[PDB]
Amino acid sequence: FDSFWFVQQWPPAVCSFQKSGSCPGSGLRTFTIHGLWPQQSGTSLTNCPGSPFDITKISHLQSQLNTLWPNVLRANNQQFWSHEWTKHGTCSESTFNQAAYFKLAVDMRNNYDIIGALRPHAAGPNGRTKSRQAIKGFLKAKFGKFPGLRCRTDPQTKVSYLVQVVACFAQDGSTLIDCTRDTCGANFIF
């Protein structure tokens, strides 16, 4: 792998697209971790042969993971962590064992506070329209590199909503680099 995509999701927006059934994320008001995805030549490496998910290797992080990496779609956090490890984590296991991988995600979340970076500049979430250039600009100023913005369009109103924010890192897992792919248009609700 040549880099990582550290993806955080905005729970309320993610769950807004679940028009039927329950969705735990509807009640969260901070960005949570979706995943840490190894990249290779501009694409996500997935399903690499590797070690099976082992909860005992991250037992010391259960408090932090339950708070920062909850399953926002269903009430089963462990299943989500297992799924992310098998689908993405195994692809960077050559350098980051399971324990180091989850610790890395936790540290990245604690050092990349999105709302904290936006709030002071009147760019915090309020259900109104925001500019893609503005949001990317504020994050670039605070963290030093451009983030990736991911949006989804509501089937009913055809309005675009910001759902995920990506922080791009080099293969060392600590050096931030510019992201290059957004799925958001010029404007979106946040």
Ligand SMILES: O=c1ccn([C@@H]2O[C@H](CO)[C@@H](OP(=O)(O)O)[C@H]2O)c(=O)[nH]1
């Ligand atoms: O909080 C979250 C956010 C996303 N997912 C995602 O929704 C799917 C549920 O089966 C999972 O795999 P998918 O890409 O492979 O199909 C996971 O990526 C969750 O489970 N929980």
